[PDB]
Amino acid sequence: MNHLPEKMRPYRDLLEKSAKEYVKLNVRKGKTGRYDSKIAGDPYFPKHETYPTDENGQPMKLLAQINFSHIPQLDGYPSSGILQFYISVHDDVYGLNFDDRCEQKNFRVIYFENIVENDDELVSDFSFIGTGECDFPILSEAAVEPVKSSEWVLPTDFQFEQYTGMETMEFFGQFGEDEEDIYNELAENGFGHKIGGYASFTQHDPREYAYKEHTIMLLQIDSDDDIDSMWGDVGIANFFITPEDLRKKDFSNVLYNWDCS
């Protein structure tokens, strides 16, 4: 039995019904191949394509790349292709769009469905990407080891309220003096790096009103001293997509968020 604080036990059946299969990403500082899933490092990129640039036309830098052929299969996710996440290196907010989290101005999400095999038609020299005045959120290339897992809905994720049928204030408030311990234990079972599953935030989930259909989390990267990942003050980043767009393999409306303490 996965542990549950005492007052939460009557809700065990509900939490089990909410369980979502996901892929935990164990990370290992080090060099990765051109076609591999990785955090930072160099991306797979065809010479004939236009490399992503930020609002001032400066080349962006790869935050992470996922090769769908290299992770456990999740319902609804592509069976192959390489999905990439990029951000500007020149802005003090890791390229987060303060106005519209889905407007790829200083961040970009690119999906290559068909992978080029010919080594000479791919970019190998990425020295053209600059160095911003601020440190990149992840300072060290890291390899990825996917492990399929499962987890109940997290209280940090706006879907929690949908499952319990009430606002979290009202929901955890019913536990009296145990409210904080209960909320914190449940929220802390989250975090870490992953594909799919439920979302963790140090502040507030931005989806309730503004992006209510972005219920699928494509990727979450947490602060992690093992690979020199640090989002502001021990924060966390994540990307979301709507079920419709994932089906269409359309990544032009992906929600990029990050927050910290």
Curated annotation (Swiss-Prot):
Top-level lineage group: Bacteria
Classification via Pfam families: DUF1963
InterPro entries in UniProt: DUF1963, YwqG-like_sf
Coiled-coil segments: none
UniProt protein name: Uncharacterized protein YwqG
Lineage, opening ranks: Bacteria, Bacillati, Bacillota, Bacilli, Bacillales
